[PDB]
Ligand binder design. Sequence first.
Ligand SMILES: c1ccc(-c2c[nH]cn2)cc1
Ligand SMILES: O=C(O)CNC(=O)C(=O)O
Ligand code: NI
Ligand SMILES: [Zn+2]
Length: 331
Amino acid sequence: AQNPNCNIMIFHPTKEEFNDFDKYIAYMESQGAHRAGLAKIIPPKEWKARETYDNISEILIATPLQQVASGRAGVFTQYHKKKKAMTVGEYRHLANSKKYQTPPHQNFEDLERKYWKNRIYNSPIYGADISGSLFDENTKQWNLGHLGTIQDLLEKECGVVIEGVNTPYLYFGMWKTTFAWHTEDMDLYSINYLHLGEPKTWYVVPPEHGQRLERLARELFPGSSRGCGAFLRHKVALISPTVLKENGIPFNRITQEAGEFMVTFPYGYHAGFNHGFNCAEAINFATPRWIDYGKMASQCSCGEARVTFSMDAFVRILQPERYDLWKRGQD
Ligand SMILES: c1ccc(-c2c[nH]cn2)cc1
Ligand SMILES: O=C(O)CNC(=O)C(=O)O
Ligand code: NI
Ligand SMILES: [Zn+2]
């Protein structure tokens, strides 16, 4: 078995290897990359996403989200308070202000220590889930707006044609902006490109140990667990690496820098935070190996999760028994 310790692997494809996206994902898995739940891919030196990022300031963040924490430093939830719209130029200025800017720090480890010590005492503002893309239309390789769709994958694998579409999302972050412990909708893959700015630190639990994280989460957020059998779908719970270690949960960590791709694999729980002003682009995708994970995916039906139009068909076809109860939670 490849990668039995479930380490995060880092790949350096050549420009030739960077042509066929599906083939390279399959290659990474042949080397055991999926066992970690997360992989880093450093693009060929010849590749670029677009020419420059000099003209992005007029992009609108229609609904910036203030991430307000409750709990303890290492075990907390966050809720999202909607703020007034602002442009990316305005957001960047806010990120760099004295109130929100990254503090002085020695290295990534120092900054990580500061994050977990102090995160709950601040409420950073995130521009999340903004439909759009910053890939140049002429970028032919690993263009996240030109990937094969999940709907076509399901059709190729299972022979059923379904409605729905699959487009990328932009994320504008600042110091301490946080993504809660989660797997993707329908336990899909995700791919994330850090276009510009300061790093993003990731934590990940191997897919084969996901239920260990779930059990700890139920213990640490007992009211939430009573309210919903899949409350991590709400994407509001944070658990620090110190608390994971104290409870024997297997996990890994890695920091993503500008110009690098991360791939998360089916049922790989992940969480993390941004170091300072940045912009990432991400999208879900599928492979033939995903189908059985999709069938298995645990669903929120309490109504909190509330997801896209396109997930309907996934639940309808892969989880017909669950479909009635789940759809009630969306409508
Ligand atoms: C195979 C077996 C179990 C799973 C699973 C368990 N819980 C969520 N997903 C996924 C794939
Ligand atoms: O970058 C973020 O804020 C969160 N990203 C993801 O969870 C992802 O790409 O799967
Ligand atoms: Ni994710
Ligand atoms: Zn729920």
